[PDB]
Amino acid sequence: GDIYVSKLQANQKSRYNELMQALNMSAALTARKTREFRSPPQEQINML
Numbered sequence: 001g002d003i004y005v006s007k008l009q010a011n012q013k014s015r016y017n018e019l020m021q022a023l024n025m026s027a028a029l030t031a032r033k034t035r036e037f038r039s040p041p042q043e044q045i046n047m048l
Contacts, residue, residue, distance in 0.1 A: 008048050012037075 019033050036047060 005045075008045075012044070012048070 016037055019030075019037070022030070036044075039047070
């Protein structure tokens with residue numbers, strides 16, 4: 001679990017950086033991504 005959560009943290013950081021630098025930023029997709037990233041940490045783990 002420790003190694004897996006480290007990997008998931010790195011990948012979530014990469015995904016957030018990609019979302020920030022997103023040319024085709026759809027309003028619905030952007031809102032969904034913001035909701036997913038702006039969620040309680042337990043909810044983020046459950047989603048992952």
